[PDB]
């Protein structure tokens, strides 16, 4: 059968998938194992359905893990020599014993590397003229528009609407069609609203029959008679003919 | 239908994952300290 024969939705779970655009080309064969008995086959992502949990986010298929509120909402602190808390003991070690005490450990470097959160990034004039990452519905309020140094990242819906309205719509943008192609008339339609062929001579079939007809209708043999060839005049040379070397 | 689409004014169409304008262009231009290691 021709390249596949495809069926109804049947539950599965992914046991092997690669995100790599090389390890997993177009189309991305999802190496899956189904729910019936766990049969492992490679079926592409076109034949897969995810239990969305939200209609928007890029990964809809995981929840929204709420996190703990801080009454010290702007008073958090972040060590930066290790932001991700990779330097911690999760279990007591067998090398924990030879540990010299907190004596002479004068400036425990983490305590002097941690920053309050406000410090890492600055709200600089780029942030004070920062342009939006969406199509703004209106920037009339933008009294910081030009003198203050702002330009939208996306034309607002309102001025797009002005620019759509102010000007017409061409009737040749709709391409309605219910009759079909007119095989006989539409091309030989009125000589004013005619389909001028364009490009080569090899597309001017009507005009050329026309040119033959006009040219014979005006040009008489009593005019086209005298027109000599080169050989019919070269005949009277004392050497009319000599083979090229 | 609506020449200005739904998803832009519809709070029902608002993104649960709308990550705003200063957010990413601030958390992006940072460069976290290059000296996580005492030696390196």
């Amino acid at each position: 059968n021709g390249s596949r024969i495809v069926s109804s939705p049947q539950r599965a779970v992914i046991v092997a998938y690669d995100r790599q655009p090389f390890f997993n080309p177009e189309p991305r064969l999802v190496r899956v194992a189904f729910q019936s008995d766990g049969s492992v086959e490679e079926v592409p992502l076109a034949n897969i359905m995810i239990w969305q949990r939200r209609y928007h986010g890029p990964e809809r298929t995981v929840g929204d893990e709420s996190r703990r509120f801080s009454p010290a909402s702007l008073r958090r602190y972040i060590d930066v020599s290790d932001p991700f808390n990779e330097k911690k003991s999760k279990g007591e070690h067998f090398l924990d014993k030879y540990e010299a005490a907190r004596t002479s450990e004068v400036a425990a470097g983490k305590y002097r590397t941690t920053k309050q959160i406000t410090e890492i990034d600055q709200w600089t004039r780029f942030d004070v003229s920062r342009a939006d990452n969406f199509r703004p519905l209106s920037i009339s309020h933008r009294r910081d528009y030009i003198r203050l140094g702002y330009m939208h990242r996306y034309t607002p819906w309102e001025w797009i609407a002005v620019q759509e309205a102010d000007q017409p719509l061409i009737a040749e943008q709709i391409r309605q069609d219910n009759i079909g192609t007119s095989y006989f008339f539409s091309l030989n339609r009125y000589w004013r609203y005619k389909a001028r062929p364009h490009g080569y001579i090899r597309h001017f079939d009507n005009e050329v029959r026309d040119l033959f007809q006009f040219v014979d209708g005006v040009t008489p043999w009593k005019q086209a008679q005298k027109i000599r060839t080169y050989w019919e005049v070269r005949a009277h040379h004392p050497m009319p003919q000599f083979n090229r070397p | 239908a609506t020449n200005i689409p739904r998803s832009a004014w519809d709070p029902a169409h608002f993104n649960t994952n709308w990550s705003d304008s200063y957010s990413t262009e601030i958390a992006a231009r940072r460069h976290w300290p290059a000296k996580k290691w005492s030696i390196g």
């Binding site: 949990r53 | 709070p11 649960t16």
Partner: peptide, 20 residues
């Protein structure tokens, strides 16, 4: 999945960030 969205994102005028 914003909690109490039918009063906050839908019916609270200022999106719940603005205090009137």
């Amino acid at each position: 999945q914003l909690q109490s969205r039918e009063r906050l994102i839908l019916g609270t005028h200022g999106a719940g960030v603005v205090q009137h």
